[PDB]
Amino acid sequence: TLEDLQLLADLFYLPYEHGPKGAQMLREFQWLRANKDSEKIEEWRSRAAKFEEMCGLVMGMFTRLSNCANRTILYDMYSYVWDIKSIMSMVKSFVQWQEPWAFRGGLAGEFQRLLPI
Amino acid sequence: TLEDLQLLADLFYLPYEHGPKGAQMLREFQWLRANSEKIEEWRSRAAKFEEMCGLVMGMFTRLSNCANRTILYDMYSYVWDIKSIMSMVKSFVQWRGGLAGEFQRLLPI
Amino acid sequence: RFLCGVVEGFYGRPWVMEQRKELFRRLQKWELNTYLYAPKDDYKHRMFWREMYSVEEAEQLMTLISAAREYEIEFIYAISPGLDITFSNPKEVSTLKRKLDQVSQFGCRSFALLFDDIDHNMCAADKEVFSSFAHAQVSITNEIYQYLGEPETFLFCPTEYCGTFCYPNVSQSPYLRTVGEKLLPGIEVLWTGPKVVSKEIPVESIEEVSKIIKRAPVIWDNIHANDYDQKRLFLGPYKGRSTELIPRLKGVLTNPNCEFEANYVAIHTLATWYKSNMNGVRDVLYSPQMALKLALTEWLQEFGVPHQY
Amino acid sequence: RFLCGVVEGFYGRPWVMEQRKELFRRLQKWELNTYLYAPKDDYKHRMFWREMYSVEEAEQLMTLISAAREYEIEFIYAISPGLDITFSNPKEVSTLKRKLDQVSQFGCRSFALLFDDIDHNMCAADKEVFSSFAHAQVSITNEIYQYLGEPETFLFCPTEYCGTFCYPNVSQSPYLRTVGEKLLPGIEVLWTGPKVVSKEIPVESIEEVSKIIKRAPVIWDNIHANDYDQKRLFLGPYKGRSTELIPRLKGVLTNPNCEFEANYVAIHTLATWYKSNMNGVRDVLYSPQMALKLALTEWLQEFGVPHQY
Ligand SMILES: CCNC1=N[C@@H]2[C@@H](O)[C@H](O)[C@@H](C(F)F)O[C@@H]2S1
Ligand SMILES: CCNC1=N[C@@H]2[C@@H](O)[C@H](O)[C@@H](C(F)F)O[C@@H]2S1
Numbered sequence: 021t022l023e024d025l026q027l028l029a030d031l032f033y034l035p036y037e038h039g040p041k042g043a044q045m046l047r048e049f050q051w052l053r054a055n056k057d058s059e060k061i062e063e064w065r066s067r068a069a070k071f072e073e074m075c076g077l078v079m080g081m082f083t084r085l086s087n088c089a090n091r092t093i094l095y096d097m098y099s100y101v102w103d104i105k106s107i108m109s110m111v112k113s114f115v116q117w118q119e120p121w122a123f124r125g126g127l128a129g130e131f132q133r134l135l136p137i
Numbered sequence: 138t139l140e141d142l143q144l145l146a147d148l149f150y151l152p153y154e155h156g157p158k159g160a161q162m163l164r165e166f167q168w169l170r171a172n173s174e175k176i177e178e179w180r181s182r183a184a185k186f187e188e189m190c191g192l193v194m195g196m197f198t199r200l201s202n203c204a205n206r207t208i209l210y211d212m213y214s215y216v217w218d219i220k221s222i223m224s225m226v227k228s229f230v231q232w233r234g235g236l237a238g239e240f241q242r243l244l245p246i
Numbered sequence: 247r248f249l250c251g252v253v254e255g256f257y258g259r260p261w262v263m264e265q266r267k268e269l270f271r272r273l274q275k276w277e278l279n280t281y282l283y284a285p286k287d288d289y290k291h292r293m294f295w296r297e298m299y300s301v302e303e304a305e306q307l308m309t310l311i312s313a314a315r316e317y318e319i320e321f322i323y324a325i326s327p328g329l330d331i332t333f334s335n336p337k338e339v340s341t342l343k344r345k346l347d348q349v350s351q352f353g354c355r356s357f358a359l360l361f362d363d364i365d366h367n368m369c370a371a372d373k374e375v376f377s378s379f380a381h382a383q384v385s386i387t388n389e390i391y392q393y394l395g396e397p398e399t400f401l402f403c404p405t406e407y408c409g410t411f412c413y414p415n416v417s418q419s420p421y422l423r424t425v426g427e428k429l430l431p432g433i434e435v436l437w438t439g440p441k442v443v444s445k446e447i448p449v450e451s452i453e454e455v456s457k458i459i460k461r462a463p464v465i466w467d468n469i470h471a472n473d474y475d476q477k478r479l480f481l482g483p484y485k486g487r488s489t490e491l492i493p494r495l496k497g498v499l500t501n502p503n504c505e506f507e508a509n510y511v512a513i514h515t516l517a518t519w520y521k522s523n524m525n526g527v528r529d530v531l532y533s534p535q536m537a538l539k540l541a542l543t544e545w546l547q548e549f550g551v552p553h554q555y
Numbered sequence: 556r557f558l559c560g561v562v563e564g565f566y567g568r569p570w571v572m573e574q575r576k577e578l579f580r581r582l583q584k585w586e587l588n589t590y591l592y593a594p595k596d597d598y599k600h601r602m603f604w605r606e607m608y609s610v611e612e613a614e615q616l617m618t619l620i621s622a623a624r625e626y627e628i629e630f631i632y633a634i635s636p637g638l639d640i641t642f643s644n645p646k647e648v649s650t651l652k653r654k655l656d657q658v659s660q661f662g663c664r665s666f667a668l669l670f671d672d673i674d675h676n677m678c679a680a681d682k683e684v685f686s687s688f689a690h691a692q693v694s695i696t697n698e699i700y701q702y703l704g705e706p707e708t709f710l711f712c713p714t715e716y717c718g719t720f721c722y723p724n725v726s727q728s729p730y731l732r733t734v735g736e737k738l739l740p741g742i743e744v745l746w747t748g749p750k751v752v753s754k755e756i757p758v759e760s761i762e763e764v765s766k767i768i769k770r771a772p773v774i775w776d777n778i779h780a781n782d783y784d785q786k787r788l789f790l791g792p793y794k795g796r797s798t799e800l801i802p803r804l805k806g807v808l809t810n811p812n813c814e815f816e817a818n819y820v821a822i823h824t825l826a827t828w829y830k831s832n833m834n835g836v837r838d839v840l841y842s843p844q845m846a847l848k849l850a851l852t853e854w855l856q857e858f859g860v861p862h863q864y
Contacts, residue, residue: 025851025858029820031236033791034778036754053243085858092862095289096816100788102293104237111240118410119461120152120443123233127148127159127476128215128222133230134170135222141548146511150482151469153445197479200549201603207553210598211507215479217602235787259568287863300863554609555598 024081031078031104032097052115068115075112079105107121147211148193148219162189169230183230190227194220211234248433249320249399249497251280251518252513253466255520256473258504260285263306265506269318274380276517281314282466282499284324284360292326292359296341298348311353323349333368333373333382334375342386343393350394357394358401359387362404362436366405366413379405380424388430400433401464409451416454426459434496437463443471446486452494463499470512471502479508483541484515484532510548514541558629558708558743558806559829560589560775561822562670567784569594572615574815579626581819585826586670586799591625591710591808593633593669601635604705607657617737620662631708632658633667641679642691643684648800651695652702654708665708669745674729689733697739710743710773718749718760725763729814735769743805746772752780755795761803773806779821792824792850794843800836819857823850 030039038046048071055064082105088094125132147156155163165186172179197220203209232239251273254261261269269281271382290299296455299307313319325345332338361383368379376382383405391400404425406412412419425435437455439447445464456462465488470480480503487498500516502509518537562580563570569722581592592600599606608632609615623630641647655666675688692714700709708746713734715721721724721728733836734744746764748756756774776796777790796807809825811818829848 022671022851022855023706025855029790029847032791033236033754034729034794035787037794038236038239039791046236046239049240049243079659088858089861090858091297091300092863093816093819095864096189097788097790098293099287100786102549102787107237107244108240110244114145118408118441120478121474124475124477126475126580127155127163129221129477130155131166131222131226134166135225137225139546142546146481146538146542149479151480151485152478153442154482154485156482193370203549204552205549206555206606208507208510208549210555211505212479212481213598213602217476218477233784235784237786302863554611 021084024084027078027081028085028101034102045071045078048074049115050110071115072112073114075108078108079112138199141199144193144196145200145216149215162186162193164227165189166230186230187227190223190230195221199221247496248492248520248524249280249464250500250516251278251282251319251499252509253282253372253499253501255282255286255324255466255501256504257286258473260288261506263310268311269506269516270314272513273319274317275520276514278513278517279318279382280320280322280497280506281500282324282325282358283320284288284358286363287328288507291324294330295327295331295345297521300332304348304352307349315353320356320399321354321355322358322401323354324360324401324403326360326403328361328364328383328405331386333372334351334538339389341388342390343418346390346394351433353464354399357390357397358436359383360405360436361405362403362407366404378419378420381428384428385423387433388428391430391433396430396432401436401521402433403436403466407436407466408438408442408444413443416458419458421459422455422501426461426504429459431461434464435459435461436466436499437527438466438468441521443474444466444486447488447491447492449494452491460476462494462496464499465491465495467500468496470500470509479503479505481508481511483511483538484519485534487519488531489519489523489531490526492520492523493528510545511538511541514544518529556830557801557804557833558589558631559764560591560628560806561818561824562591562593562808562810563777564591564593564633564775564810565780565813566595567782569597569816571849572619575619576622578815578822579623579628581822582628582720583688583718585823586830587822587826589629589631589806589808591631591633591667593635593667595635595672599733600633600636601721604634604636604640604654607654613657613661616658616661621633624662627648629665629708630663631665631667632663633669633708633710633712635669635671637673637692637714642681642695644680651699653666655699655703659703664706665710666703666706667710667712667745668692668699668843670714671712671745673714675714687733689730690732690737693733693737694836696742697737697783700739700742703740705778707742708743710745711738716745716775717751717753719751726767728767731764731767735767738768740770744768744770744772745775745808747775747777752777752783753795756797756800758797758799758803761800764804770807771803773808774800776802776807776809779809779811779818788812788814788846788857790817792820792843792847793828794824796828797835797838798828798832798835798840799833801829801832802837819854820847820850820854823853 027041033039033042052068052071070076082101085101144158147158149157168184169186197216200216252269282292311321327342346424366379368382372382378443395543406419408420409416412422438444440451452463469484470477472480501511515537518540519532522531561578595601620630636651670692677688677691681691696711715728715730718725722732747753749760778795780794781789782788809821811821824846828841831841
């Protein structure tokens, strides 16, 4: 669908600006995070549920995209789609609430640790 | 020469162990760093290191002229980087995630 | 009896068909005998495992498997459905059967099921149906094994694939105990040793593993693996694995550097190690320094042969 | 005359010949005209610049320049000798002439010399011969351009290619001073704007360069470039550059995402921007919001057409 790509481009937009949908979604997760007794619990779960709905809209689109006839466009950018799909699963879940690597560089790197720059 | 690949293999050896020629240079450079009639010693060691530094550069350029570009092209990206670091080590002796990141930076980790 | 060769199981740019054909030519030359196809970033293997092959894809896999048979190399085809498979879903087992069925029409007779580098947590639906994660993997692996008429060679790769990865420890691991108990005796298990990249794989380490899995493991060695760091390459010799280990394993498959041409010493030295004790009792026979000298000596002539990029 | 198109000038995996041909099809389709071949990690462009082409490489480069010419696309060949050229050595210049001579035999009429991501330090021999870094490049560039019989399209890429790279500033830069004063009027100069990846490219900032370099530059836009971060991709529209910029530039070449297929919006929106003020004299004519609506509309049909990997 058209709307699918609009949401897609919004997540991977420009270096100094995210798209409207991507920025709308980020603002809401950031809001939820910032928030008998006072009735503002009505707005928080109504707003958490409307967000858990958007987390299922974006994830529906992703699955849809992966089933596209053009396997050439998809193979080139899906690695990026697979990352944001994993970061939005644990965001939705958030709302609902060895050894050779750590000593990187090898020989070149070991020498660099003894250098000023 | 076979002696070149012995040096090449020593510089890019094993995950937990460096080859002897690689381990030798690092130790000599680790020694020059920790120092300032012991002048003639340091100077003899700083000058002999420059020669090793200089000859390693020789093997590095020798390899780049190899007939087998298929082998070369696969591993020269590493050679060039150790060559950059080897020249300034010697010259020293002479002296942010996108929308994915924005969200993950707010998740419990 | 002994599966010894290479595993293209690293992350990053998978090798090309020309390189894979060259691998078999080299394996055959060094008296090696196996090739496990597990490229993590080759979408039809891991990320998009459900996706079937096109005419062209089928055609080159047809040539590759052909090439393997010509060079006496055992072509084991692997698939990692683990990141998103619904184990209780019969549509998911049907897809894996059609996918491995297409691959058996290419000339494949050896397959593998990989469950490495996945979160131990099962989805709602898998939790009702399966006692644990270990049971879900083993039910699918066994149903697939039998469906493919119980192939001679079938490998299984656990989530807890090294010493470090076992919860709480290798010996008290409920997962491995399930794996060795309920996984069929005709299916082998892959093991990387005490760590992912093991500095040494002690003869005790594996004896202890074989006790829990109730069989000798196939080693998926990461000694020369270099995918976890852009700045590292490994041209050193095969070192840390006693030649005494061979009569205690059903195999050894090295996972080497992503750059195909930088694996000569890596695969050369391994072959010197396998041939030094390929008849034993269930280092006097091999020395890395010696095998390294023999490897670089032959590699040297290769650098002199004109090969244009 | 205005050079508008793409620049494959990113760090990372260079595009294949198949992708470069389809690109000329898309460029011609969207009324774009230029292509600058500059893969940073194409060893015969940077690192191994001295190395001559093999038969197969020549044949592939021949087929590509043929395809370029056929789709009314200007093929501009670029070379970066800067990491280790010795500016004073006539053997280094003789090598640069031989390599560009070999490329002109492939049907290439347009060329470039890039000195973009290098240190300003010159080897003792070049200090004895040349009075500054800027003189070394200008002398070598002017000799090459003249040698190549002064090609109509000859581009030059400075070390100080953006506002931020200029020492001390853009108007007082002694390097740019020399570039504009001593670089031949027929040779074009690449510019990326105020920074590398510029948020906006003001009309004022271009007037400031145009004065010091004594000409209107060709922009080497990095708005859609994503080689500097593994987790970033750019599918948004060409935004930040006014249409008032076209009557003030000799061209706009976009260095896009490393992933060839992801650049449909990058090149589509670039075409829209150029065509909106294609005949400018001296943003009311272009709307990134709008261009994106049309770029996606046309992209959407592509995802529906079957294509196999
Ligand atoms: C059963 C073994 N499976 C594994 N899969 C990963 C590989 O893709 C890597 O190459 C390796 C390491 F060397 F980086 O780490 C692990 S071990
Ligand atoms: C004339 C400017 N030359 C440049 N060379 C680099 C390119 O290889 C990159 O693709 C680009 C991106 F990192 F922004 O950064 C710089 S701009």
